[PDB]
Amino acid sequence: KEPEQLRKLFIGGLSFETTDESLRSHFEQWGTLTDCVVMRDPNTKRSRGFGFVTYATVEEVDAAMNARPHKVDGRVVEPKRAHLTVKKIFVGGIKEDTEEHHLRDYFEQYGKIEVIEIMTDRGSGKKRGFAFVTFDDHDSVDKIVIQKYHTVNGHNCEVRKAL
Ligand SMILES: O=C(Nc1nncs1)c1ccccc1F
Secondary structure, three states, X not given: OOOHHXXXXXXXXXXXXXXXXXXXXXXXXXXXXXXXXXXXXXXXXXXXXXXXXXXXXXXXXXXXXXXXXXXXXXXXXXXXXXXXXXXXXXXXXXXXXXXXXXXXHHHOOOOOEEXXXXXXXXXXXXXEEEEEEEEOOHHHHHHHHHOOOOEEOOEEOEEEEOO
């Protein structure tokens, strides 16, 4: 079984009327939930406006994120994986022979790409061996940076969030 941390979604922006039960009934549409909790004040029991759900598998987390936007008890909520929320990555280690279609063909399966920038030397024009990829949504980046490995154009790449 995949590590539990990788099967969790934090859910922000909840209606204060959302309960453990109503959050569960909503998100069980996309997989088996092993946990589902609304965070509440310890004294008033008033909702803190966020909670988390834990799916049985990572593919179920993906299904839930692919079904955004989620309207839960009348309010559009904000699900995020286990936050520095950005849409852009640095990709290093691609050397000189890696081209845009290499990066596109690989990264398009994580999310919709809006910008690919292969970095070149300001003086010579030679490729510097790294690039930036911008997606239309942060979950692409979140899926990417939790992978242990990225292989693009036969190169073992270093990938990190870019600010
Ligand atoms: O910015 C991109 N490529 C180029 N950048 N300079 C010339 S063409 C790009 C954007 C979205 C999807 C695929 C892409 F390649």
